[PDB]
Design a protein around this nucleic acid. Structure first.
Lengths: 203, 108
RNA sequence: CCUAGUAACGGCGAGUGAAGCGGCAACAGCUCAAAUUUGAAAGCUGGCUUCGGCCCGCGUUGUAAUUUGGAGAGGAUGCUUUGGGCGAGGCUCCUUCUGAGUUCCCUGGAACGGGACGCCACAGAGGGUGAGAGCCCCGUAUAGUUGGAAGCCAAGCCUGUGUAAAGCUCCUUCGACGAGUCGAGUAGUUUGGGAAUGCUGCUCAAAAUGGGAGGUAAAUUUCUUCUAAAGCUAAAUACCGGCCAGAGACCGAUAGCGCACAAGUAGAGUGAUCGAAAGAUGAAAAGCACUUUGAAAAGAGGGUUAAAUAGCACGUGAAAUUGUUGAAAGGGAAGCGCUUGUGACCAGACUUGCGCCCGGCGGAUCAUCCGGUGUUCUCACCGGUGCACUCCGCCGGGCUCAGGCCAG
RNA sequence: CGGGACCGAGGACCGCGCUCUGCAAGGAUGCUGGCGUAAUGGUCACCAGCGACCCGUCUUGAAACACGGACCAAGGAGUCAAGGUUUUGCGCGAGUGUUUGGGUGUAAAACCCGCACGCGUAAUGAAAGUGAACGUAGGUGAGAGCUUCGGCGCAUCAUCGACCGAUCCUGAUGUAUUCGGAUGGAUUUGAGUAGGAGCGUUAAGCCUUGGACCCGAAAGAUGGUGAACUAUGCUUGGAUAGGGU
RNA sequence: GACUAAUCGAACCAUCUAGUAGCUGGUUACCGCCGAAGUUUCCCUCAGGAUAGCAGUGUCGACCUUCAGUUUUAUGAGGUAAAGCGAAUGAACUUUAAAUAUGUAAGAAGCCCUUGUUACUUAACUGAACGUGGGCAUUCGAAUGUAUCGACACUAGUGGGCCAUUUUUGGUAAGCAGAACUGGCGAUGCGGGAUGAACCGAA
RNA sequence: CCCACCCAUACCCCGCCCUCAGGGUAGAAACGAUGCCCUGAGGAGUAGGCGGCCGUGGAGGUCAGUGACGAAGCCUAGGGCGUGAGCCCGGGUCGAACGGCCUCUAGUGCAGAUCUUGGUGGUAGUAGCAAAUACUUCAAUGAGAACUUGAAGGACCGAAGUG
RNA sequence: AUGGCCAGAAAGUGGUGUUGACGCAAUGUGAUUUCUGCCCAGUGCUCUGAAUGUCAAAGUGAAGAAAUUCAACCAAGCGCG
RNA sequence: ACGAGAUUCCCACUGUCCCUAUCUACUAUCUAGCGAAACCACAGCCAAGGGAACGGGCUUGGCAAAAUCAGCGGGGAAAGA
RNA sequence: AAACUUUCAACAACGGAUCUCUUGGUUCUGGCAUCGAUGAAGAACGCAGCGAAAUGCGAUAAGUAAUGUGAAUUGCAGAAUUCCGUGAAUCAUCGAAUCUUUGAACGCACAUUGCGCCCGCCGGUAUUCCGGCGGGCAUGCCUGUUCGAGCGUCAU
């Protein structure tokens, strides 16, 4: 299995510039941090659950918070990207757990947020006062607001008295019954119409 | 290295069905036997259970957190009750767990 | 990066070959058409200006404001939001300036070599200077320090305040959303999508909870996802062209680019095009005055150089091949192997060492004892003690042993 | 009992012995002479006796034929990458792999970090799917090593069994009375289980694909340049004594 | 099939392009240790293939069992020579028995005995097969030899060549043509046949 | 038929080299233990396989390495070591760098390829240098005159010319 | 001549063609003299003469819920005459 | 009729022979000057033998004396072979 | 014996190998975004006291201005530099200029230094003739201005 039957030597890519590109990326990150100081270098990201059954056991960072999440957290959608909150309008909240977790995340960020006034001589009501403007700050929201518990806890201790009785008939038999019912859902409903029609005809 | 080659020494002398759009994530389901089930418990806690200092506590093991979807039944288990949460289980695995004194719960 | 040489395609098989998820780099969002401003085209190109404006026009077959599906429009409702002007200070780019031996001796034509004595080092990278120089020179390291311009960022501080616009919450109602386009057949081409791909041509040609997709053809009943046929947008990504720069376990003038040189030159071809060879005197020309022989080129003396055994044929100067000198062989080949011989020319080896017995000198680092010190803890060294029948050197004699080559 | 040739390996003693003050007994000593240098020895040139085809290369079984070689200097031909496989060394070990990336740096070095992921830890079946202990992880015969001397028996081999998946037959208790598939059988099958062995890396050998050890063909294709030679045609020019019939 | 710039059954130039060749030529120091090969068997042959065999490096296993291109013994093939027929009978007669080489067998891993079953077989529990238990170590049941074992892994060349003795099958006017074994050669120097691929001696 | 004699790398005895095999060697006075000591056998080789060593360009370490009182290179009827590839020294020449040891690395070793580039031989002072009718005398110039000039002679082109 | 023979990728393109059967184009033979062995009807040349026999795409009908299937009709050429 | 087309014969004519001889010019030759190339494993006397029908080198013989010049066309070399 | 051929050695030749060098290649890495009708890239022709080329430049021609440095250039010739300076230099920087004929190349052409047209200025006796100088004259397309055409639609 050697795919060398084309003119492969004309598009061979080497990577001698790997440390130089790392140096260039680090210089760009330092310049971005110096330009964005005292704001963090990145935006706040929500916690979302990965698709498919292979990866639905793990959570990660998403693109941006939903409009419903921002509305529940009390942050207007025009203010949100101006104070370092990423906003996604395509994502929806199909369940209450992820919505509540992201609302709590937004509330923690808003509680830890320091908002400087646009004009220093005229502070506003929603603006952080100068005597609380000084504190120890963070510049990495991916570090200070990462995914703390990506997977579920793999070990838990319970007392011997509260051991559940489990599914009657066994877990293996329950799985087999579920598969059999899923395969036979249509035929049983068809013979249900057939029995109903026979009863209506010969009532 | 060129000096170690033999050429320097030889100088001077020369079926079934087709599946369109297969997605492996549908069929992702790694399996673990019951004789490696106690290895998922942390080592100190596992040694306490195996010594017998915990006679009133039963460990709950989530296979999906460790990366397993099915519990298979190769090996034997000690007489310690264990709670196992798994997507799939085999008949012999559940039988051996119930002989050990625990229960296999089904999750998704 | 992984998925993955996998799903998939493929005569008579050689082969071909993605995508979702996941981790990361980088992250940034928006603008129209479809609405009546209708109590006032509120919009704009151009021309002339006294810089206040005024005209010629474009445009109602639609230029502004408002709305773009995430919504919005209309209501209700009560709160919040905004404009200018300085600006300390900081950063980017050119500019002035930066440590220490030419101390003594030897070799040498010349010290930058060897020896001795110093010094500087946030500088012992590199180069030059008559041979290997941190301190002779340029530079090199580091903080800064002179002078100048143009930008950007920016802690703060002065003032206007609501005519206007803007945000938030809720809602009966309304809620326009791109057509020869989508889609279908067919043909060509393409793809892993030769049942599930895309593009184009011809023919047909839509709809309003409609339409597209949901990788096996079709009908029926559901469900899930977006919202095409209009448009803009940094970054992470590519880079055998250009410009500036730094490097290398690369090549060292038949190598390395064809080209280290007046090289894409000389030269060839009608032309498209083809396309070389060729670096090094010496530290410094000090590149040979003057005399003599030649028509001249040059030769010989004689200087120059550290060297002409470096003479602009020029560092070093191999081999093939040639000339002279010296030695030798040769009656239709030479060359080679074994073994003598002759001639020529050479490397070794040897020159005496060691041990006793006397005699004559020069000295007391002889044995024992005491103290100090170190060690392997019983062995040593150091300082006093020897008083010459004891130790150590030197010179004369004698003896033994071992010594080179060839032999009986 | 004589006569002659060639040789002297070893390097305290030990041993076997004898003819036993010692010896010819597990390998040469003793005495003497000349010379102490080109005398011995060596190198080169040449003569002499004997010996001796010109090298590759190719062919088949081999020669012969053929082909290359005037001479000398400098280049000058099994390399690199990717992916396998076996063996060697190394680290860790049911795990292993820091280097896509991040941190850091005296800055392409070195050092540090972890999520995912790759391979391994489970197989079989076209698929739906199911999924590896009757037994001190079994019996018998060997088997190194150990043993309390009764045996215990590593690795490995032969053989009979046991379990898992696929195939075929029967069809139990139960029941959405038509779902479910227990139990008992029979053939093969799988590098399957039956007290894990792998992952990374180094070195070497061989394939496999790339120009693939080096030098060559008649070719094929894409885009350009030529009628100054020559061929034909057009326009406009030029040229060809003296005789015979 | 003439000419188209010394180029024409398809001009010249550059590029794809280092195109392809199975065919030709070449392929670079030394020493040491081993060291070969030509129908064996299968495939439709030539413009064919694998494969057996023969080798080298590593290892590992108790390098354990010993085996052997040999002789002897027993028994086959060759009964063929031969002796006798005052043994019978008449190479085809036999008491006996040739030479050359040649097949099989010659132990504790073996030999029997006993018990059952049999789905084998036999008229048959009868033979034998499979198991079961026991007896045989008193000599392990000829000679000679024995640095000669076994099993993997990886790697390589050669695998329908030449000559000769013997045996055998066909032939020709005479030449000769197939096979089977063995030896030599290709891979090999030395001594002798004056000389030399095939001779003799000896490596 | 008989006696004697000649000699092969064959056979016998001895020495030395290599390979293989079998033994010994620590309360270490003890060793490039990867060493040393003892004993025996064997020695051809194409294709092919394997091991060890020599050499070249460059890199890390090291030798307190060599060197203008002469590095590298080159020449040598001059020597020493190694079976060998090779290594080392003497002498001459020359002018600025270079080597040993252990590892690392490769564009690493030539007699051939009708090679590639450059240089040089024998042939060999050889083949030729012979179409177009043809040259001669004096003087001058000059170092030098068949092929320069002037004069003097002789010729040729022959008007589709040597104009 | 709404032609023939050519050419061009195509063109509101070009040539023959400033042409018109005493012409243009294509063939074969090759002055003059001589000259057509005798007769056909197998291959071929050409006749829109009847047929649907073969019969493509488009178009038409039937079945089905549709994909689809089945039917006729079916140009030229071929076939028949 | 015409023809640098192919063929047979006759008269004339003669150096085609028979049968060769002689003359001229330019070469070849020698000298002065100038001066290559092809080719070249190494070399060049033969005879017999050298199994593979081939010797130049081997074996056994004949032999065999420096350095050369003009010619020649047997080998050996030599044909863009 | 010499000559000749061959062998060995020394020196001298021929030739340019070897060794050492290296203002050059080759490969990697980092940074930057900037050609042209306001006339590019390329081509030609010229320019120095004494140059053919390379280099630089354009009739302001190995060059001008400006800024900076501060005493050269060099092969010869000739001049310097008030050195206590508006200043050497084949110096550096570079913001102002010059920039021949061409070329996308632009009046029409170009194998010609060919032929024009429009408008100004100057000179020669010149209202007429002659000469010189300066500024212009390509194409496609856009916006606008102005002059127009057409029973195409109307009003009057």
């Amino acid at each position: 299995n050697n795919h060398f039957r084309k003119h492969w030597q004309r598009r061979v890519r080497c990577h001698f510039d790997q440390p130089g590109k790392k140096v260039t990326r680090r210089l760009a990150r330092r310049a971005k941090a110096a330009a964005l100081a005292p704001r963090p270098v990145d935006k706040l990201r929500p916690i979302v659950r990965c698709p498919t059954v292979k990866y639905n056991r793990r959570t990660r960072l998403g693109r941006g918070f939903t409009l419903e999440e921002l509305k529940a957290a009390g942050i207007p959608r025009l203010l949100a990207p101006t104070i370092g909150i990423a906003v996604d309008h395509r994502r929806k909240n199909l369940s209450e757990e992820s919505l509540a977790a992201n609302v709590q995340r937004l509330k923690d960020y808003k509680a830890r947020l320091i908002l400087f006034p646009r004009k220093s001589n005229k502070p506003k009501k929603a603006d952080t006062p100068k005597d609380q403007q000084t504190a120890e700050t963070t510049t990495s929201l991916r570090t200070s607001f990462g995914v703390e518990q990506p997977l579920a806890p793999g070990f838990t201790e319970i007392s011997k008295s509260e051991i559940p009785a489990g599914i009657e008939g066994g877990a293996y038999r329950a799985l087999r019954k579920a598969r059999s019912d899923a395969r036979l859902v249509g035929v049983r409903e068809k013979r249900a119409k057939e029995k109903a029609e026979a009863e209506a005809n010969k009532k | 290295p060129t000096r170690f080659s033999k050429t320097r020494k030889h100088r001077g002398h020369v079926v079934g069905m087709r599946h369109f759009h297969l997605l492996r994530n549908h069929y992702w389901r790694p399996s673990i036997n019951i004789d490696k089930l106690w290895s998922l418990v942390p080592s100190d806690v596992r040694e306490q259970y195996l010594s017998g200092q915990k006679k009133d506590t039963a460990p709950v093991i989530d296979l999906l957190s460790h990366g397993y979807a099915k519990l298979l039944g190769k090996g034997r288990l000690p007489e310690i009750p264990v709670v196992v949460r798994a997507r799939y289980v085999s008949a012999e695995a559940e039988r051996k767990v119930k002989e050990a004194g625990g229960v296999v719960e089904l999750v998704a």
